[PDB]
Design a binder for these strands. Structure first.
Lengths: 114, 48, 120, 122, 215
RNA sequence: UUUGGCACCUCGAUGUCGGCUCAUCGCAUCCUGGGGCUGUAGUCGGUCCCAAGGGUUGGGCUGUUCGCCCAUUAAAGCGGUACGCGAGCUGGGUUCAGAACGUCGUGAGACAGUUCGGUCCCUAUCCGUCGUGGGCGUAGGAAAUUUGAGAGGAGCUGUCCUUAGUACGAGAGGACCGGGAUGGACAUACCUCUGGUGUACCAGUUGUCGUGCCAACGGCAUAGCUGGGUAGCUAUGUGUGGACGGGAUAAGUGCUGAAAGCAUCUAAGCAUGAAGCCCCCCUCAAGAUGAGAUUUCCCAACUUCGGUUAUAAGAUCCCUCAAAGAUGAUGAGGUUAAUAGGUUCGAGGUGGAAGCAUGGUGACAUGUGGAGCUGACGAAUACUAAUCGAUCGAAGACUUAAU
RNA sequence: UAAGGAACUCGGCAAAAUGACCCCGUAACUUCGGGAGAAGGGGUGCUCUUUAGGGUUAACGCCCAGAAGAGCCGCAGUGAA
């Protein structure tokens, strides 16, 4: 065996409490912010734009609009700085990377449900 | 592009010492026919 | 993979013609690069023919040429029919393989390595 | 990744709207700036009234870039437009309000006044 | 002190303390043995010699490097070892702490050790002066007929010649390079791997040598 | 490094200014100042040593070497190097034929005063100048395992954060010595991440021609166009490096100490003293044609054991390849051999089927349920080569004296 | 082709961008002709109703539509050139 060592050595850093989700789903990610004072937790909520990689290198990106400014945010899927992940909506898309949402606004940038 | 001096006989023939043909392979025909190219059933009398 | 000295479309066209003539004739003679490439093409075709259903028949039509074969006792089949009919029955027990390559000498006009590729 | 000649929208109420960058402060030869760096810039489009006037040579801090930052846990944050905020060479702003979200790394350069005024720091 | 030989397997990442992401090279260091001690009284310098990956016993009429020849067998017969694929010598160890025939094991390094890592770099073939060195290209419009060439290569009648070491095109690639001051992230005794923070020189499955860093 | 002379070659031709690209002989030095001394309070000024060790910016403005402002920075020489570099590149300048204005000329035309337009060649050889191979060598046969002389080469610089507002200083400002992050360059290495490409991967879509129709598909239209994208190759991405610490020293500071009967850093001694000079990255490294150091094999049947067939140790030819590659070299491997490659079954990663059914008047939707791919990332195999394969490869010097 | 967008350069040189058809709109200035396609805006696929046009009119049927409603699909509808 030579083909399993990466999978074997990093197997203990996979997390198992994560829900399943797809691009198009709407997530509420509870992330923990460690300023020097405290260990507070803040939720980023938006649409899953992207999902890629495998193993411990897997990675997803969520997008929202904050004050008229679109903000996107990319996390390692197995990071210990995500406290929990809630799936709020199921989107209906035709496509695995929804980059066409970066140039839209309003009722144009609206994702159907289920 | 031009040579300033003509090259002599000795420099020409010193340049041609690697310019030659290598000796071929010859795994011999044991069943029938002329000796064929190595690892071939060659097209003239091949009985590999 | 090899490029065979051709553009992308020319190479696809040449490989489809090579694989079709091998199905027609069951041994053909070509240059050694080309046969080393047509190994894979015709072996995936024979795999599709062994699988045998409609979806793989439609996948196999994407590659074979539409060539008619004059068969013994004066009959006629297309090459898709010979592939899904005859050739798929020979290789139903063999798992892979199906083509053999035998070297020849150089050609006369170049020194190109000739080769015979044959079905087994 | 802001260099010489780029145009940044201004994210405060000091009267500037558009700004063109002249230099990236830092070392000799420093080519690009990102979120948290201080640039010196010209105002190419002002708001009538307003403190800063067209043709002025100011310095700003970059909040919000389009190619945003990598953080230490390997997460990233990007924005949809490059923006800046005109500062008072003691890292206080010249305006009084900040529009739009603002990256968290502004706290590492002690721009506390900007970070306080902003709608949520991201 | 403390060297070992491995094959580089590939690169992944690991989450460290307080969630910091750490990129990691996994190096499989399996079946090292001490083949020889060299001494200042026999060879004039103190060192040990380690073989790394074991290969098959000598076989009559074998063509490849999968099988030992007779000299390689007789060398690995002095210690009670199988023939090994690669052999290197280590000079930074203390030669008294070792025994010929003993196994050098992966757990001689602990997590937190700072190491130096040597390998032969990838290999790129004939490359020109833009890639091989850091040279800048000519203009790509405005009538220029000068794009990826080097510039002038000397001056004139003074020095009517080209100086040695001139940065021309040529073969770019596989030289031995060490990186210094990398570190061990975790050591896995069961799989016999080291995780090294960073990337190391060489292609995948190529030999690497780990030593304890000096500086 | 503008004039004089020439004439001391070149009217059988030595390509002219800027700019780009690339340096570097290699030196009275801007920065660091590294150091230090004073008509040196820190901050300056000035001088000395040191340095071309290392560094030494982006723009607006011209006709050109000349300049001038904006904004930075620790900081913005010296030119012989054919005012370095056109058989490496540009052609803005000057100057060739057109044309025009000012002015001079009776005129043809001139000025060099302006102005708009305007062709810059070469397959590298006797040769001289980066990378990569074959052999004359090779002194036991020979073959597999490492010198470190130097031929050596790589120079690598610096800014902001805690000691300590302590000290200088009246205060302002403001240390030396120790403890944190940057800019540049890369020395650089690498693809886990973020991105780029990805012409034999997946999906959508227009026009037209064909497969007898439909439906599917195929050809062509830049890969037809669009959206993604695996390996590989990559920077703008990710990592590491440099501020080694020892010797010897410069300017300088000394101690002892006489000559020169005192004093005095010097004559003899002894200390100290700098990014400069010499020692801990990389190739050759018996081509260091003087021929370095650590496991196997070695003997004829004759045989001035020369030499002939041989016969001997390990190498090759040939064949499947890739982590290596212009070729050759390197490496993985070859009839016990899967071995290496293909294949076939896999999975990993990339992008929702055909058919059937249901709903809908229809365009379509939904279910049957993560289908193709595997093109480039595990197991099984003989599909695959060498047919019997064949070929190459000693008789240990000698001597001399030191057992 | 990420980010940036003339920072290149003697000079935006070269390339990129614009482009068809339909509908709305269009300045200064003028020799009253023009300028002018100024600038600048919007639309375009497919299916079904329909009332009705060019009518193919015989009439809806035969194609484009009279052009209005209601739908369907895609990232994108003069989906290429």
């Amino acid at each position: 065996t030579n083909h399993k060592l990466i999978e074997a050595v990093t197997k203990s850093q996979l997390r198992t409490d994560l829900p399943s989700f797809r691009p198009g789903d709407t997530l509420r990610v509870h992330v923990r912010i460690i300023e020097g004072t405290r260990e507070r937790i803040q939720v980023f909520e938006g649409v899953v734009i992207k999902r890629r990689g495998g193993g411990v290198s897997e990675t997803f990106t969520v997008r929202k609009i904050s004050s008229g400014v679109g903000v996107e945010r990319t996390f390692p899927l197995h990071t210990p700085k995500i406290e929990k992940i809630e799936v709020k909506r199921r989107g209906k898309v035709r496509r695995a990377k929804l980059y066409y949402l970066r140039s839209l606004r309003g009722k144009a940038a609206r994702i159907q449900e289920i | 592009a031009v040579p300033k001096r003509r090259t002599s006989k000795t420099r020409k023939n010193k340049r041609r010492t690697h310019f030659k043909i290598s000796v071929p392979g010859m795994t011999e025909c044991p069943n029938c026919g002329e000796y064929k190219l190595s690892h071939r059933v060659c097209k003239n009398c091949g009985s590999y | 993979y090899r490029k065979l000295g051709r553009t992308s479309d020319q190479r696809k066209a040449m490989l489809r013609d090579l694989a079709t003539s091998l199905i027609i004739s069951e041994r053909i003679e070509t240059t050694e690069a080309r046969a080393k490439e047509v190994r894979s093409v015709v072996e995936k075709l024979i795999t599709l023919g062994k699988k045998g259903d409609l979806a793989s028949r439609r996948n196999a039509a994407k590659t074979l040429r539409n060539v008619e074969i004059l068969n013994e006792d004066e009959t006629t089949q297309t090459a898709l029919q010979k592939l899904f009919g005859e050739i798929a029955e020979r290789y139903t027990e063999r798992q892979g393989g199906y083509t053999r390559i035998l070297k020849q000498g150089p050609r006369r006009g170049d020194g190109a390595e000739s080769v015979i590729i044959e079905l087994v | 990744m802001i260099q010489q000649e780029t145009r940044l929208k201004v994210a405060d109420n000091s009267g500037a709207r558009e700004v063109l960058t002249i230099k990236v402060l830092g070392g000799s030869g420093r080519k690009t700036a990102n979120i948290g760096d201080v640039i010196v810039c010209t105002v190419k489009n002002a708001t009538p009234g307003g403190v800063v006037k067209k043709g002025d040579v100011v310095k700003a801090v970059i909040v919000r870039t389009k190619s945003g930052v990598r953080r230490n846990d390997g997460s990233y944050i990007k924005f949809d437009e490059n923006a800046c905020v005109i500062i008072r060479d003691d890292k206080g702003p010249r305006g009084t309000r900040i529009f739009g979200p603002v990256a968290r790394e502004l706290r590492e350069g002690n721009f506390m006044k900007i970070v306080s005024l902003a709608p949520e720091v991201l | 002190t403390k060297g070992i030989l491995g094959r580089k397997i590939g690169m992944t990442q690991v989450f460290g303390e307080n969630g910091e992401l750490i990129p990691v090279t996994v190096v499989e260091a399996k079946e090292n043995v001490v083949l020889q001690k060299k001494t200042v009284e026999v060879d004039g310098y103190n060192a040990i010699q380690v073989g790394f990956e074991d290969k098959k016993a000598y076989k009559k009429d074998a063509k490849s490097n999968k099988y030992a020849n007779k000299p390689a067998e007789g060398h690995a017969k002095k210690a009670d070892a199988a023939p090994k694929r690669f052999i290197r010598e280590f000079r930074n160890v203390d030669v008294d702490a070792y025994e010929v025939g003993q196994e050098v094991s992966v757990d001689t390094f602990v997590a937190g050790d700072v190491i130096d890592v040597t390998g032969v770099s990838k290999g790129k073939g004939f490359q020109g002066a833009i890639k091989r060195h850091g040279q800048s290209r000519g203009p790509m419009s405005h009538g220029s007929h000068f794009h990826r060439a080097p510039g002038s290569v000397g001056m004139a009648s003074d020095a009517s010649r080209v100086f040695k070491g001139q940065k021309m095109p040529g073969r770019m690639g596989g030289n031995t390079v060490t990186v210094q001051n990398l570190e061990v992230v975790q050591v896995d005794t069961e799989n016999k791997v080291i995780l090294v923070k960073g990337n190391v020189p060489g292609p995948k499955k190529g030999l690497v040598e780990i030593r304890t860093s000096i500086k």
